[PDB]
Design a protein around this ligand. Sequence first.
Ligand SMILES: NC(=O)C1=CN([C@@H]2O[C@H](COP(=O)(O)OP(=O)(O)OC[C@H]3O[C@@H](n4cnc5c(N)ncnc54)[C@H](OP(=O)(O)O)[C@@H]3O)[C@@H](O)[C@H]2O)C=CC1
Length: 411
Amino acid sequence: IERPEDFLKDKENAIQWEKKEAERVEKNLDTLEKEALELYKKDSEQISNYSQTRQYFYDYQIESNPREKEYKNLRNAISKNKIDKPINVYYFESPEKFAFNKEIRTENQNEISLEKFNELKETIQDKLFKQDGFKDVSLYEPGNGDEKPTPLLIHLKLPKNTGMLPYINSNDVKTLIEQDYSIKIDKIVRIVIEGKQYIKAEASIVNSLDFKDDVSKGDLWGKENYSDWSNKLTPNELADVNDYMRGGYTAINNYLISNGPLNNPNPELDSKVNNIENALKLTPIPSNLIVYRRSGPQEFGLTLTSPEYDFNKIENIDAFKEKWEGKVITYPNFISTSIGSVNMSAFAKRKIILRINIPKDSPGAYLSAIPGYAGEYEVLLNHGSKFKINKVDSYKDGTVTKLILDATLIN
Ligand SMILES: NC(=O)C1=CN([C@@H]2O[C@H](COP(=O)(O)OP(=O)(O)OC[C@H]3O[C@@H](n4cnc5c(N)ncnc54)[C@H](OP(=O)(O)O)[C@@H]3O)[C@@H](O)[C@H]2O)C=CC1
């Protein structure tokens, strides 16, 4: 191995090695992949932005989008070169990315008051932040002369077989990766560059299965882990689960939401909730997995008429963030989610997307593994589940702005 795991401050060696690696990897690229790279160096912004929200449209809108072809080829290009050993990378990020919607400091100021520091630390302490899309990173710590866009510097360790594309831009070398994981900030320290103070954050990666728009693959994973689930259930448990899916969900979830088990107990309904809950514990989720849910306004105390529901006006986004960002919401009812991220008719009008990170071994079941329910790619989560809303983002779907809530199931 002619390479360390981290070049640290050795800019000269990092560049010499990366320039060599760029020439080596270029030999494994197609005409189509090369072209995709050329489009990137021509307009990083557009491609990057597209790579972040691509999977939320209708399957057909994704397939026919002019940029989709570019995305796929550039993505293939990156996967072509999987590193044989771990490596650390560096890149500047905006504090808002981690729900810190205030400035750490200004360019004018050189120091960062302890007040800000501790506030950032408490904000991005122990939370999982999902990262998506293409990103340019550096193989050495930004020093003098280097571009320093923000006061927040991230130091990330990329696992062994992570895709990485080193390439020569104009005269210098750059590195391209595609984020497809969640980040964790293990530690932050104050450092000084060119006489100015910056925050360096030590980050770690946490992997999760996220099928995004590839529902076929998701369904395959679901069938393989839950095709025999029904056989593990007692006759009474299967009966209640079938009852639920067949239409019983209405009475049951209304009973739960109106808090009937304490305000108007119904033994026959309590029995069903119990059996379904037990059914969801027979085969806990086999690994970290991301699921999606398009929520109606009522789930967040709103109505299709509420003025706060119009996210086209930023004041309303700021209001929504102030109320929910960093908070935890509880669902008394069982919550159905999809392993797929794509939009579906009947959900076209919903403007809130709940992107949930479910920990390995959490209760839950892929209901769509039961014949007769193919088309929903449904993962049902247990009633009373709690979700911590880490970060709130937005994107435009046509003329309507929608929100994506990066959340994590906690229990
Ligand atoms: N939602 C999804 O993304 C997915 C839906 N499905 C399937 O779609 C079909 C129906 O879906 P959908 O209508 O979303 O189902 P839900 O049964 O979850 O929604 C019923 C309605 O009740 C409201 N509601 C749900 N949970 C709460 C809560 N905790 N607090 C207050 N109100 C709540 C919503 O109000 P609202 O309209 O008024 O504001 C929603 O319109 C089912 O067969 C389901 O299995 C499958 C996978 C995913």
